[model samples]
Target: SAIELLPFHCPFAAAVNPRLAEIEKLCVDWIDEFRLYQDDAQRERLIATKAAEVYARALPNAAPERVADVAKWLYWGFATDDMVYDNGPVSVRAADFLPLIVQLARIADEPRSRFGFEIPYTDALRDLTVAITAPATPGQRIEWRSTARAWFFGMSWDVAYAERGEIPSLNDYLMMRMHTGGLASWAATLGIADGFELSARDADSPAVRALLESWSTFALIINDLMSYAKEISSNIITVIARELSCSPQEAVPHAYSILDRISGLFLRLRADLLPGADQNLRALIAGMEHTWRAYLDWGFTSARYTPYQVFPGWAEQPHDTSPDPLPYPAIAWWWEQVA
Candidate 1:
């Protein structure tokens, strides 16, 4: 019960992109900005886990300047997850936490100093919200704020569900998982980071929403699959366990099957939707596909997914060297729509 039950490997590390040393250094700045490490041990685990590197790797196509922004949000998210929802007294207080984030979202739009409004872990957020929207198009800013709002609402569902001690129905689970995972914020940042603004008309299209939902669902489901053992031990309910009514031991391959199928489906949707897409849409989706592969590659390598221990120990899994030769093997079939 103390061991990691699922073995994992990344065949795509070499194929995706190399880790960025510059951003690794930049991460220190962001960490210092938020005062995340309170002690030597915390600092050690912080650097050892190398989460900033993970975010940078996950958004390799992001412009150099914006990678810093993405990294900040990633760092902020990790800290919040640790302090608020994961381990804080506020974890079960869904209703109480809701207003905190709602105010944070509101502040982002109003763009004023939140003096005398101190809260743990929100300074970084305040800065990130303002920064992302400052240069983004009016439409992109709307998307960013809307996504952030949805993310907060999603958090409310997660805590409420956990508070009730109930496993949500599949429909309920899917709906909450999408928002709870903050995929909307992640996807919104992709455009903001890339200096692109999708037209509101096309952005709201059925095909576009489907694309966003597919990518959002795919990213988090894949994360859940990777972290299955960790979540199981922590008593977090998982979709695979709920959907199949099985124990964690039996859920691994079911999770994998889901990952395999969704990867294929995501590509097909990209193929079906891209040709007639506006140039801006094409560009935006390209960033997204690249991000999907980057995230998948990072997932296989992140310590967050490991149940047993941190580095070297986590890296102990033998990677497949059979050569996932093409870049973005997860989305390789996407060349069916490649320019």
Candidate 2:
């Protein structure tokens, strides 16, 4: 039996966009048009994953069209990552993955320019980038490009390690996961999709940066936990198992401990910032919390992670909800920013 770990503390209230069905229908139509999957079997699995629901939850306040646009990006990302990076023959070859990501990153930089050749993910990504950035500022478009590049760069790190046939140290994994988790790319869209722009000053502030890292770390850990069963990639649990010389099942509690601290850190940072924060900053923080809430809800209910399975009970409160900085030097800086 898989050792079921209960969800840790999530302080955000849950909300789902009322137009979820409408948003999902748009994504489905796009998926069919793009021919995103290898075949019907792959398409069925992707749709069954319910990728659209969490985006709706993440951006509940956005206009239906805005939510639909972001969901399309999510679907495209899921398909590209699932098909190309995670399981592709190039998954273990940095040399090949490197060139491919560069091309994709270039498309992100110049979404409108035509590429002579065609790759489904690249072509779809170009179209999605143009659509999503249409409502964004020039700086925001640049921000999106940077986040996309970060994601592309980060996955190459994962591929490099896979090629080496070694698990990274805890510090290395934490540092790399901030990008590989894809939350940064998703976060960059919050302002655009939610109908506001987080000022570059506020966005770059030390406090906000801490919250960004916390949100990404928190959600990705939950993702690692939920997807542990089907995961073939190196994740927190896999790293913990290797480092502690323990079974993956036994590493469950250790992963939860980290999650609890991250949850605590996130709450404290938001509370401290909210009283004095401007509207834009507050909205950004709220979006982060909303996204976190969505991930928690999705982890248990999504068919991708849970399929008629009776899992463990969730705690009403965090088991180890302490704001103390974690021992991992790579991520411990988060606590220091929580004035």
Candidate 3:
């Protein structure tokens, strides 16, 4: 299957946090307390997302307790993503979505801020924010909040375009994908999740930024490819199909080629950094390696991406392996960040 073959080129080996039972218990308790699901079926779908499994795979070396904390955020975030951003009433209404996002931002930035009425996702998120930030350093907290805001604004861009019934240009879509695809927030949480606090200077370095962007780009594009059967809005496949006047089937190979190119660039970038990287930088790079690979490992069998009853298995060989920079101006700097 294409899903199984999609990540054949991923370089990182797979792992899982040893505390899966503990982590999943915490997630279930939070979901029950917040009443995150609308009904039994939604509850089934939400829980079946296996967010704990995915995050556990992504940060297998983290303190078990911290993994539990951040995994709950993944649980809540995915629920909010599926129920609210992708399906609920405000899913297509930028006017409605923006104000709600602003209110949620307030709660996240200042948990004590009052909003006139209650929102289930917001209420749940406020608690998750407090828990996730409790152990984070000042800088980690700042980046966490900022990345979340980026996700919110990116979602706003998606809904705004959706409201207008327009397809985002390939350039704009690729640019905003880090945020709109919700990978930015996930990327931000990696440091804290791994119990490694990168210094503010190191965190903001061009190479680190490029690495994080590459992580988001690779995973999000893979996500679009794997979840094509379940997608509602325009994704890279749909956008590529439109751009080249090609069928979705034809666009699939283009997306795969982009992933292959990204994987090559990521490998070289990591190799260049590791020899000279400080302890914290080394850990950050290794952590992202786990992240992209885990998304593939988890998604291969997870119900989240399973449109049919069948799930994909890993491929014996990758489809492509080119390190050349893609001919897209929006991401030209990604290449420049490397040798």
Highest-scoring model, lDDT: 2
Per-model TM values vs. the true structure: 0.79, 0.93, 0.92
Off by over 4 Å in 1: 1-19, 86-91, 111-117, 233-237, 307-339
Best of the two (2, 3) by lDDT: 2
- Please say which candidate is ahead in TM-score: 1 or 3: 3
TM-score: model 2 vs. ground truth: 0.93
Candidate 1 backbone collisions, by pair: none
Tens digits of per-residue lDDT for model 2, 1-339: 255666557656788989999888988887888888989998987787777889889888888788878777778877886767556454458997887788888888887666566556677887788889888888778888899899889888888888888899877888878888778888888877887667878888888898888879878888887777655347888898888888877888888888888878888888898999888888888788788889878767877776533446557888786667889898888887877
Any residue pairs clashing in model 3, and if so which?
none
Stretches of model 2 off by over 4 angstroms after superposition: 85-91, 113-117, 308-311
Q: What is the C-alpha lDDT of each candidate?
A: 0.62, 0.80, 0.77
Candidate 1, residues 1-339, lDDT tens digits: the string is 222333443223422224467767777777776787557676555565566555565566666567666667777676666666556544367767776777776766665747456567666777777766787788888888788888878877777877776677554555467688888787778778766777878777766665676577657765665565555411223555676687665665555454445454555567787778887788677766666656556665666665343322222333222212123234334333322
